[PDB]
């Protein structure tokens, strides 16, 4: 599961994301969303990003499925960017019924060059 942080939901944890990262560049770690309470295997999870400037940043491989409380994303990637050092708020949706949503504010800053 690696390094984790709490999300704004009491039911989920996700990987720690680089504070600043380059557009369309693979992440230093596989993005992981960890479910605390029971969530059936196969449950679909998705990540979406946005903020005041870019309300819906384009992402790559932003879909995954739970397997033992962990939804591991395969090469998740932030293509859209946050701009004038203003960072992204992640929206993590776990598709149970109804869906469970967890936000991660100022999770990451995506510029064209990166650090």
């Amino acid at each position: 599961p690696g390094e984790l942080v709490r999300t704004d939901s009491p039911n989920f944890l996700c990987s720690v994301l680089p504070t600043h990262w380059r557009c369309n560049k693979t992440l230093p770690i596989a993005f992981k969303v960890v479910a605390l309470g029971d969530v059936p295997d196969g449950t679909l999870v998705t990540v979406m990003a946005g903020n005041d400037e870019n309300y819906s940043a384009e992402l790559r491989n932003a879909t995954a499925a739970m397997k033992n409380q962990v939804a591991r994303f395969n090469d998740l990637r932030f293509v859209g960017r946050s701009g004038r050092g203003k960072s992204f708020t992640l929206t993590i949706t776990v598709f149970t019924n109804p869906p469970q949503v967890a936000t991660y504010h100022r999770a990451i800053k995506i510029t064209v060059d990166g650090p």
């Binding site: 999300t7 704004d8 939901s9 009491p10 039911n11 605390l36 309470g37 969530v39 998705t46 979406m48 990003a49 946005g50 903020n51 005041d52 400037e53 870019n54 309300y55 819906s56 384009e58 992204f88 708020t89 929206t91 949706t93 598709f95 149970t96 019924n97 109804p98 869906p99 469970q100 949503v101 967890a102 936000t103």
Partner: protein, 130 residues
């Protein structure tokens, strides 16, 4: 599934919710890079299937929505997807647990513009059975 011990309190006192509990600009975000003509079709077809992705533009808070009763393929009732209430646009209702609190997303979207107004409501009924 999982909620904080005091949902209403969290819903009423936290800036995240408050900044979202009043009608504000919302915008469909599906097929972001595609011909507006197509996006318009995608949106309605998806609405008829009971799903959509609508972000709150002001804060960039993206949401994937399911227009079905929290209880639970099958076409949604006019209660969650209304195409009549007002010609030109569609009224949508979507339950979910957001940051540990049971809420209901309500709003409408212009079938032409693919933009609109919507907000979050505390779902008392759902909140207590959790």
């Amino acid at each position: 599934p999982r909620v904080v011990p005091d949902q209403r309190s969290k819903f009423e006192n936290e800036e995240f919710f408050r900044k979202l509990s009043r009608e504000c600009e919302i915008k469909y975000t599906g097929f972001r890079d595609r011909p507006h003509e197509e996006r318009q079709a995608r949106f309605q077809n998806a609405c008829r299937d009971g799903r959509s992705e609508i972000a709150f533009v002001a804060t960039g808070t993206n949401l994937s929505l399911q227009f079905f009763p929290a209880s639970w393929r099958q076409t949604p009732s006019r209660e969650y997807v209304d195409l009549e209430r007002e010609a030109g646009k569609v009224y949508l209702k979507a339950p979910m647990i957001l940051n540990g609190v049971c809420v209901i997303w309500k709003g409408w979207i212009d079938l032409q513009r693919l933009d609109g107004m919507g907000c979050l409501e505390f779902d008392e009924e759902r909140a207590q059975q959790e």
